[PDB]
Design an enzyme around this catalytic site. Structure first.
Site, PDB file in Angstrom:
ATOM      1  N   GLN A   1      22.290 -18.117 -18.648  1.00 49.54           N
ATOM      2  CA  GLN A   1      21.365 -17.601 -19.745  1.00 49.54           C
ATOM      3  C   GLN A   1      20.457 -16.715 -19.287  1.00 49.54           C
ATOM      4  OE1 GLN A   1      22.991 -18.245 -22.929  1.00 49.54           O
ATOM      5  NE2 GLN A   1      24.226 -19.514 -21.509  1.00 49.54           N
ATOM      6  N   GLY A   2      20.286 -15.310 -19.899  1.00 52.22           N
ATOM      7  CA  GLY A   2      18.930 -14.718 -19.619  1.00 52.22           C
ATOM      8  C   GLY A   2      19.335 -13.689 -18.783  1.00 52.22           C
TER       9      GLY A   2
ATOM     10  N   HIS B   1      27.336  -7.699 -25.881  1.00 53.42           N
ATOM     11  CA  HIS B   1      26.857  -8.971 -26.768  1.00 53.42           C
ATOM     12  C   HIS B   1      25.221  -9.162 -26.426  1.00 53.42           C
ATOM     13  CE1 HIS B   1      26.662 -11.147 -22.664  1.00 53.42           C
ATOM     14  NE2 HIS B   1      25.752 -11.982 -23.316  1.00 53.42           N
TER      15      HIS B   1
ATOM     16  N   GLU C   1      10.010  -3.904 -13.655  1.00 50.43           N
ATOM     17  CA  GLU C   1       9.433  -5.247 -13.819  1.00 50.43           C
ATOM     18  C   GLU C   1       9.624  -6.129 -12.704  1.00 50.43           C
ATOM     19  OE1 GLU C   1       7.687  -6.567 -15.707  1.00 50.43           O
ATOM     20  OE2 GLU C   1       7.931  -6.403 -17.928  1.00 50.43           O
TER      21      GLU C   1
ATOM     22  N   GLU D   1       5.317  -1.033 -14.382  1.00 53.14           N
ATOM     23  CA  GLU D   1       6.285  -1.050 -15.499  1.00 53.14           C
ATOM     24  C   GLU D   1       6.110   0.301 -16.295  1.00 53.14           C
ATOM     25  OE1 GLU D   1       3.556  -3.346 -15.128  1.00 53.14           O
ATOM     26  OE2 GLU D   1       4.217  -5.294 -14.665  1.00 53.14           O
TER      27      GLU D   1
ATOM     28  N   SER E   1      22.624 -12.162 -18.664  1.00 53.30           N
ATOM     29  CA  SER E   1      23.391 -11.317 -19.531  1.00 53.30           C
ATOM     30  C   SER E   1      22.991  -9.805 -19.411  1.00 53.30           C
ATOM     31  CB  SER E   1      23.729 -11.881 -20.974  1.00 53.30           C
ATOM     32  OG  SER E   1      24.323 -13.114 -21.028  1.00 53.30           O
ATOM     33  N   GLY E   2      23.929  -8.840 -19.505  1.00 59.05           N
ATOM     34  CA  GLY E   2      23.670  -7.445 -19.456  1.00 59.05           C
ATOM     35  C   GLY E   2      23.207  -6.943 -18.052  1.00 59.05           C
TER      36      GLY E   2
ATOM     37  N   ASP F   1      32.962  -5.830 -22.849  1.00 59.09           N
ATOM     38  CA  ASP F   1      31.417  -6.273 -22.826  1.00 59.09           C
ATOM     39  C   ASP F   1      30.325  -5.302 -22.130  1.00 59.09           C
ATOM     40  OD1 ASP F   1      29.246  -7.782 -23.752  1.00 59.09           O
ATOM     41  OD2 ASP F   1      29.592  -9.289 -22.581  1.00 59.09           O
TER      42      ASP F   1
HETATM   43 CA   LIG Z   1       5.543  -7.282 -15.374  1.00 61.82          CA
END
Ligand SMILES: [Ca+2]
Length: 223
Positions: free
Chosen positions: A174-175, A40, A52, A62, A177-178, A84
């Site tokens: 939220q945010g 999704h 990160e 990074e 996900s994955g 999913d």
């Molecule tokens: Ca950063």
């Protein structure tokens, strides 16, 4: 992540932000060239961001790498979020170092009560919106199949599991996900869905990675 804690910069080195102008999903690095995430989360033109901590600040560890290819699970159903999971291949291989490290796939499923680390840059508010800039972490147990299916009747498949606390207060959101659910050194879960965040009797739903290992390994090998 609601009711978690700041992980600490690069303490979850398999954790990936998927960026398409802005952070929109988590992901987990599984080897130098491949990330697992939620189907999704699928979007054209993903840049995977590795190493990160603060997603808003270049801190020096990074790697930003464009996706060359996304493969959503053949049986992904976006209505139900059944299956999913998706693989994202990196245009060029991540440089593996102490801050950018892959997580092992499971060789078997984990059981109810196993403690897992769930991480992400999603909302940290139970009611309202605050998104953290640093990666948040939550330790949470795998919940029983029965308590999972009772919370979400008619919605839970053998490809999903619940982790968290029925009492609420601690969840993915939220945010997130994955993003990874890691138990005993393995990627067991992917942040999939839920009803609100950190609500009583509404634990997070996670893609059950151990059902997908042969699919991931075959797919990666053929791609
Ligand atoms: Ca950063």
């Amino acid at each position: 992540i609601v009711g978690g804690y700041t992980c600490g910069a690069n303490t979850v080195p398999y954790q990936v932000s998927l960026n398409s102008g802005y952070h929109f999903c988590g992901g987990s690095l599984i080897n130098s060239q491949w990330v697992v995430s939620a189907a999704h989360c699928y979007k054209s033109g993903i840049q995977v961001r590795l190493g990160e901590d603060n997603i808003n600040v270049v801190e020096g560890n990074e790697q930003f790498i464009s996706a060359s290819k996304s493969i959503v699970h053949p049986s992904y159903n976006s209505n139900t979020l059944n299956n999913d999971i998706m693989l994202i291949k990196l245009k060029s291989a991540a440089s593996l170092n102490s801050r950018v490290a892959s997580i092992s796939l499971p060789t078997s499923c984990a059981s109810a009560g196993t403690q897992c680390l769930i991480s992400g840059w999603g909302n940290t508010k139970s009611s309202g919106t605050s998104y953290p800039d640093v990666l948040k972490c939550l330790k949470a147990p795998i919940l029983s199949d029965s308590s999972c299916k009772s919370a979400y009747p008619g919605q839970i498949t053998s490809n999903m599991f619940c982790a968290g606390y029925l009492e609420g207060g601690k969840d993915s959101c939220q945010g997130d996900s994955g993003g990874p659910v890691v138990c005993s050194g393995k990627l067991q879960g992917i942040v999939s869905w839920g009803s609100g965040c950190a609500q009583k009797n509404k634990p997070g739903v996670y893609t059950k990675v151990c059902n997908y290992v042969s699919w991931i390994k075959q797919t990666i090998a053929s791609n």
